[PDB]
Ligand binder design. Structure first.
Ligand code: MN0
Ligand code: NA
Length: 163
């Protein structure tokens, strides 16, 4: 794919703005985490199908965090954005994406971190307003690709329909 740079291996990096980071995880757990080290700690976790409400432990920024999660779906995996605004506070859950292809994407743009949400094949975007957004450093725990924003409809197509 001429619009799909990669695959790249799990790494810690400061993504450039206006680029979608297309994530291709395999198992349940932490997909990606990122922070500005001031007032936003954001991660995305992945939940396999058929998970009744339960406490699960996730390794987030080097510590054990217990979260109450669920995936009702039988056919779709669930991405959940988790976010805290202070180093010592609680994570809250936002912008879930129920996904058949098992693909996710994040982007730093216009004061925000954008992710996908909703239900494939009709997924939309949401965002998290982030102080000094372009400073956000990210660790991907899975293989990933890069797509420019000017080709967002293509990133959206990948999110909805897979590679
Ligand atoms: C308070 O405003 C916002 C934000 O502009 O950040 C609005 C945004 O739509 C929302 N996104 C979503 O819920 C999902 O995409 C986001 C979020 O709830 C918080 O940032 C989490 O701390 O809050
Ligand atoms: Na999301």
């Amino acid at each position: 794919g001429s619009l799909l740079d990669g695959p790249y291996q799990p790494t810690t990096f400061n993504p450039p703005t206006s680029y979608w980071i297309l994530l291709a995880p395999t198992v349940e757990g932490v997909v990606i985490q990122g922070t500005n080290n001031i007032d936003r700690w954001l991660a995305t976790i992945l939940i396999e199908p058929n998970v009744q409400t339960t406490n699960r432990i996730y390794n987030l920024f080097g510590q054990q965090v217990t979260l109450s999660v669920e995936n009702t779906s039988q056919t779709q995996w669930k991405f959940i954005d988790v976010s805290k605004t202070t180093p010592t506070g609680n994570y809250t859950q936002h912008g879930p994406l129920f996904s058949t292809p098992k693909l996710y994407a994040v982007m730093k743009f216009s004061g925000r971190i954008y992710t996908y949400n909703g239900t494939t094949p009709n997924a939309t975007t949401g965002y998290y307003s982030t102080t000094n957004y372009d400073t956000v450093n990210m660790t991907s725990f899975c293989d990933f690709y890069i797509i420019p924003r000017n080709q967002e409809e293509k990133c959206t197509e990948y999110i909805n329909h897979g590679l």
